[PDB]
Design a protein around this ligand. Structure first.
Ligand SMILES: Nc1ncnc2c1ncn2[C@@H]1O[C@H](COP(=O)(O)OP(=O)(O)O)[C@@H](O)[C@H]1O
Ligand SMILES: Nc1ncnc2c1ncn2[C@@H]1O[C@H](COP(=O)(O)OP(=O)(O)O)[C@@H](O)[C@H]1O
Ligand SMILES: Nc1ncnc2c1ncn2[C@@H]1O[C@H](COP(=O)(O)OP(=O)(O)O)[C@@H](O)[C@H]1O
Ligand SMILES: Nc1ncnc2c1ncn2[C@@H]1O[C@H](COP(=O)(O)OP(=O)(O)O)[C@@H](O)[C@H]1O
Ligand SMILES: Nc1nc2c(ncn2[C@@H]2O[C@H](COP(=O)(O)O)[C@@H](O)[C@H]2O)c(=O)[nH]1
Ligand SMILES: Nc1nc2c(ncn2[C@@H]2O[C@H](COP(=O)(O)O)[C@@H](O)[C@H]2O)c(=O)[nH]1
Ligand SMILES: Nc1nc2c(ncn2[C@@H]2O[C@H](COP(=O)(O)O)[C@@H](O)[C@H]2O)c(=O)[nH]1
Ligand SMILES: Nc1nc2c(ncn2[C@@H]2O[C@H](COP(=O)(O)O)[C@@H](O)[C@H]2O)c(=O)[nH]1
Ligand code: SF4
Ligand code: SF4
Ligand SMILES: [Mg+2]
Ligand SMILES: [Mg+2]
Ligand SMILES: [Mg+2]
Ligand SMILES: [Mg+2]
Lengths: 455, 455, 455, 455
């Protein structure tokens, strides 16, 4: 999921459309914008892409000087964010979340026992309920208080008629950054949103920090003095857009260095290096460049394989009909190929890619993954978690190489990964979460905790 | 436009969906399939993408053992091909064209003076009328006769209840190839269609050749003994998909060598090489690889900028809101950049790209084009032609350079182009049309001839 | 089908929208408007209702000072009229037909043997082909000549850049009338269109007459000196809108008199008179009024049973789920009911209505039909013809009574019908066609002649 | 709004579709069904008509043995009912309301001060919140308790996995009735739903009664011992379907007697009586029948003037383009006309109708309304309330006549209204609410009370 907010701009909702658009890759299962003129909050949101949602429901209707918007990844319209709430006497509150609350089950029951009704399936709503059923005089304080009860990953955009309030979990598991458009303030899951809308980078939101932005500026305030830096590794490996800089480190560049690292760890002798569009192009470029083997487009992703697309019958696929990707035998025929991918999860893609490549007449396929094996669940986002079984969880690397049918299989080591990304922080893992590789989670996982999809 | 036919396959219409899908890049302004069981011809076709056309109108309805399908590029439903015609006594005829008939105006008047009514704007219809108002006993012959009266570029798919008939203009200006799916025969504008559906390459259809395919096989027959090989250069430079092999030469590989050629002609000293997604990625890879400068993603194309997408107000764009592309300052900031593009037409894109790149903090932009300047009209397809004025037609490489704002600007020479593609044919231009560069057209252009868009 | 044209009005296409709208009942299977400014012809047309076609495709795009429009009844977007044809040297022609050409098969072959290609399934196209392949210098003359070769029912609207041309078959089987909007001329299948758009009635187009309307006025010209008046009876009984006056006789009033006639022929003793909405409301009002029995709404038609509507499973219908109509037991329970309907065709509706009425607790059902039995095919329109078998064609009135389950069944006699409508022409059937009752067709029916649906 | 529930039927959701369909006239601004198999509650709902909602979202998905459905009138998807609520431990609750809670503002603040979040704008949600934040052990009791805190009009359908619970406000302002389908129980706003789905009438739900229906039957329980019968008069005059029997009195028959009453109060000498389709057809029939003047269709409502329909420019309307209705001059030309309408609100319709009728050449128009003037707000439904100003509130009868331009204007007296409906309940107004005529409301209207639209 991706979130974008901006405060202090005539066309805040348009900017949000564009910002949110640049984050559209974060998920395409819904989208929404809520905007404020100072008096009223306007809002349109729906399922599907941002474009399926607007000009299928007018962007003109939503008007304001501040807005927050959310792009939802999904595994019901009630769940499409931002969530907006109105009240008789106390005005309005819109909220948008990226992450996952690892104690949400707990809190829902407590809040339900206190008499809260839940209408969505979102964590964002839980935050809404804590805020309401909170003692403090001010919202700033209701929020600070509520935040400190949440466990897990969360980047939160919240706004009312008069302010925008931004908060990041004290591990800073998800990225969140701040930018300037003149005097406007902009806040986005990824920096690419800034590039796209004309915003200048300012800095990251600090884990455990909270920003209150309004017509007289921005103020920062802690809500968790002790912080334990562990940003999601997959943001770097896979999930963010390559033009984004996570913490000033560019995602393309990082992923390319992950390729150089792979080349230094497990070089093999070969004729062409291909990436997989679009997950592992930057790794592949980096790998080829390190080894001296030429980078080729040995695999093509069909640009138009949306949800509209009719799946070939399984019998057709046996026949050889491709769906999303195919191997270019124009390029690989008679070559021995290094196929670089960002990661392996189920293993199903790499097996398929190895098979197509051989069916295009590659003589060797050497699969090289720019991540350590993925053997543990994620609990910090629906986007990053999965219900699918993990191959790395039960198969050794060699057991895996046999399953995908590669000639060789190589994963980046953890040091390689950490070294490749080049993150500066002082501890044995550079302020990154590595839970899904190592099994060592940066927050406690309770026994009532459900997997993000399980909601 | 792109055309796909297959004869001898239970699921000919499904295969055509998938084949046509792989050619979807050829144009998205309409699409259609016509299929035959041996008795009746079924057909669904509409405007928009293949997916907007199917599951918006059922693919299940169209059933057969042969089908031909067309994907239309455009600058009205009546014009979406294939064109299907029925008759009381003489059964049916479906026709699909890719190319442009440089004498269509002439023929229309003659056929109109003979009492033909025209209901579409397509060249395909002209062929239908010549066939009908033709003397010969058989269709094969009516077609051969009709064909010989056409001037220009044309790949034709034609079919009836009982046969499929394929024909290519005797210059072979557009590609057309044949493949096998078991015993089925398959014919497509590009080979990538074969890759995608499980077809094996057989050969190209010969310029001036005509194929008749039916339940007992395929037969070839000339309709123009003297042929003059001049395949569209842009198919190689720009227009085909990179996994396609035009005449056994792979389009990715070719375009990459065009990069190597650029590097040998006009190397400059720089820090990063970027392509433009997706037009000039392969050129860029090749250029970087030749020069030793690192390949980076210094430009990103937003994946979701469909026709649904709301254009930023011109005032917003002045503000810095991007549409389709943006420059990654995460990558270029402080670097001197070689920006490789396939071609320049209006010049408007390259100017923009140069500006964004400088706004992302690139210190130098060196624009290097993997084509000779484009200074003459195309007359051999709506896809390849344009109503926009050509910058290269009135500006020296210098006045252009100044106009896009590049530090340097370099076009591939013609020899470089010919050498890069590396066609082996014996004549001064390797069996390629270079008309839009050189002004020397491979067919005669009459005075009544309209530009392809003018229809 | 219904046709509307107007010449000499800034907003001719809007007027046509509205005119066509008032004729929407004529059929809902497509619709189109073609308009001219004097230079170019603009045109939008599609399948479905006029509103599904406009604001699903803009009315703003079609602009002009004359337009013709068509509303199509159906049992292909190629078939939606008007048909528009363009040419290199000779400008444009749009044509719209209401009726059916009883020799169309003949003509198509002849025109096909002369080398015409047919792209639609419409009669309108045949006229287009005769006009083109016609010897005379002027269009007026080409049309007159072409017309005289047509056999059957036809009201034609035709127009070019400069004129509108209107023609009615020399039997005047379909209505067609002329009106004035200021200085504009208006032509419509039904007069209700005039009421709706602010047009004044002028007169009927004479059977075998042809109008040429242009910027200097209207001129009349015969194309068949000998005429034989036989207007479709169903236009009066059923098919036209009740606010329309066919030949100055109002359709409501006529149908009501048909009710008075029924009352004079076969009065029965009963408690309530119900019509069937909406086919036989006026008849029912008239019947009740004659007999003195009270008019009630003993049947209700659900206003929202469009094509979107999910048909109840046949098992549900056995359970008692209704679709379009139901009987009001609030009104009929314990009463003996006269149920008046305009006509019987298959018989399936009257049986159902009799059953529902008995299930609402009516003690008697007396079915009284304001038309003679329908025992012969129609050949003069798809609207008026049917592929369904005619009950009256094989069943005596008695049998039909037994089949619908009525207590009594009564059809209007032919004299009653003729007397009720009240037309004053001097011949044994008052200038009406009674073919589907009597079997005596007012034009010759050839052996190659297909039923209007068979196309 | 209209509500339909049925318990104990394999196809409960289909039946609900059909039942809801028959209540579609109640409003077309949304629709929804929730169904239960005993374990899970399934639900589809959306904006627009029932058919726009289903087969645009599958009815097959929603399955069960009980269901409740709602059809919403509106002047958001969040507001489309039924409202469905789920919980971790306590299962599910769906609720649907028809009516309006005249103290909802009060209760929302109280519930908001107790920490409730409100996500819809509906009264239905308020009931949901009272139920949750209620002390009692059982739901039956939580509801009874919650109900007793509501002020205003309310018919409520509520259901869970195991039961259906129905309740009517102790004034019985909205109709609600019970029927049988074999052993199934059916509950609907109007009886016409029963007719349509094959249900037998059982009785009305008693004002202040509550039904609990489950797999072992139905049980009744009061929640307000003292009841004060005042059913909405407009249900009879206008709002219900003519085949519905409100409290055993048929709505057609009643409205017809309202015509007889009008005829007895203010007969005038005239030539034809027309109603207005479809609001005042039954009144008109009754009037004509009383006076002996013939009933004619002097006005026609265009059947296809949906929300899709393009409104004629105001300039066109000045020209004489009609929208929904037009006058039949075929019928009224030269006649003096009694135009009977159910009611007058703004007065805008009657003025228009009088004008069209004169433009069709009626010599006199005598407007006769089958309701007392409407001079006071409604507070008991969005359907029945309006934001438009009431003409009768500031204009004397004779001042309205001048405004609509009638020759004469006549309202039914209150006695006439009461007498016509035939009602005899032992009080001065027969158990009907007459608030919008008299100003004497049957419940107290608080100072915080907003007009139903104001939400
Ligand atoms: N506009 C864009 N340009 C380039 N890369 C992008 C863009 N948007 C997202 N991405 C990248 O796409 C990658 C995944 O692409 P995709 O092929 O859809 O993934 P996968 O094949 O694994 O399902 C991500 O790792 C991300 O960096
Ligand atoms: N599925 C695909 N994968 C990669 N490249 C593709 C694909 N389909 C088409 N192309 C390529 O895209 C290029 C043009 O992409 P695009 O960015 O849309 O062009 P442009 O930016 O010039 O308008 C073509 O030169 C073609 O080779
Ligand atoms: N706007 C209208 N108002 C009243 N009657 C109309 C209107 N439009 C068409 N009609 C009438 O509707 C009748 C048929 O209505 P419908 O119930 O659809 O026919 P059927 O039930 O036989 O299929 C026609 O006989 C025609 O006169
Ligand atoms: N299927 C139906 N058949 C007949 N009358 C109906 C039907 N459904 C609703 N009605 C009636 O329609 C009347 C209003 O019709 P309409 O013309 O839409 O109202 P109005 O013109 O006042 O806006 C109501 O008074 C109601 O009794
Ligand atoms: N790690 C990861 N990879 C993903 C995700 N979604 C798609 N992918 C892609 O899926 C690949 C592995 O797919 P799998 O092995 O499960 O078939 C990775 O290369 C990556 O490109 C996700 O959420 N996480
Ligand atoms: N030559 C050519 N380039 C095209 C066409 N359509 C899009 N392009 C793209 O447009 C670029 C030049 O755009 P322009 O200079 O006209 O603004 C080329 O790099 C190519 O990527 C086309 O039909 N022909
Ligand atoms: N005569 C006739 N009736 C039609 C037509 N379309 C619908 N109807 C209706 O169908 C009724 C008879 O239906 P059927 O007996 O075929 O079931 C007539 O009352 C009329 O209301 C048509 O084209 N012709
Ligand atoms: N009383 C009433 N009439 C309504 C309503 N909606 C539509 N109408 C119609 O509107 C007519 C009066 O329209 P008006 O005078 O406001 O222009 C009544 O005859 C009735 O047919 C409603 O909610 N209440
Ligand atoms: S477990 Fe893996 S995917 Fe999840 S936050 Fe940590 S690094 Fe990211
Ligand atoms: S046969 Fe019957 S339906 Fe046909 S034109 Fe004659 S009267 Fe009309
Ligand atoms: Mg990948
Ligand atoms: Mg390019
Ligand atoms: Mg009828
Ligand atoms: Mg009314």
């Amino acid at each position: 999921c991706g979130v974008f907010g901006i405060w202090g701009h005539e066309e805040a909702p348009q900017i949000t459309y564009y910002g949110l658009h640049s984050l559209q890759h974060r998920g395409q299962e819904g989208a929404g914008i809520v905007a404020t003129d100072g008096e009223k909050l306007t809002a349109h949101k729906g399922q599907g892409l941002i474009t399926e949602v607007f000009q299928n429901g007018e962007l003109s209707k939503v008007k304001g000087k501040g807005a927050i918007g959310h792009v939802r990844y999904a595994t019901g319209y009630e769940n499409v964010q931002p969530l907006l709430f109105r009240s008789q006497n106390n005005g309005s509150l819109a909220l948008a979340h990226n992450g996952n609350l690892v104690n949400a089950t707990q809190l829902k029951q407590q809040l339900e026992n206190q008499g809260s009704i839940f209408q969505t399936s979102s964590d964002t709503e839980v935050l809404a309920h804590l805020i309401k059923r909170s003692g403090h005089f001010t919202l700033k304080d209701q929020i600070k208080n509520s935040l400190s009860m949440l466990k897990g990953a969360y980047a939160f955009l919240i706004m009312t008629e008069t302010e925008m309030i931004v908060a990041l979990d004290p591990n800073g598991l998800r990225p969140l950054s701040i930018g300037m458009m003149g005097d406007a303030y902009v806040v986005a899951s990824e920096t690419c949103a800034f590039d796209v809308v004309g915003a200048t980078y300012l800095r990251e939101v600090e884990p455990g920090e909270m920003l209150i932005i309004n017509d007289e500026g921005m103020k920062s305030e802690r809500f968790s003095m002790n912080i334990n830096r562990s940003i999601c590794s997959m943001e770097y490996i896979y999930f963010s857009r390559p033009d984004s800089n996570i913490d000033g480190i560019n995602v393309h560049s990082a992923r390319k260095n992950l390729g150089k690292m792979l080349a230094q760890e497990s070089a093999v002798e070969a004729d062409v290096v291909t990436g997989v569009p679009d997950s592992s192009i930057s790794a592949a470029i980096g790998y080829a460049e390190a080894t001296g083997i030429p980078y080729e487009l040995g695999l093509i992703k069909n640009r138009y394989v949306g949800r509209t697309f009719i799946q070939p019958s399984q019998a057709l696929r046996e026949q050889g009909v491709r769906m999303k990707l195919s191997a270019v035998r124009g390029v690989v025929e008679g070559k021995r190929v290094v196929m670089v991918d960002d990661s392996i999860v189920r293993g199903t893609t790499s097996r398929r890619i190895v098979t197509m490549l051989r069916e295009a007449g590659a003589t060797e396929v050497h699969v090289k993954i720019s991540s350590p094996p993925i053997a543990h669940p994620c609990f910090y986002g629906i986007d990053t978690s999965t219900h699918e079984e993990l191959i790395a969880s039960s198969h050794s690397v060699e057991e895996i190489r046999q399953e995908i049918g590669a000639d060789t299989l190589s994963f980046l080591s953890v040091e390689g990964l950490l070294k490749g990304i080049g993150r500066k922080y002082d501890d044995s893992n550079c302020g990154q979460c590595l839970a899904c590789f190592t099994g060592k989670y940066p927050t406690e996982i309770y026994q009532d905790t459900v997997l993000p999809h399980v909601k």
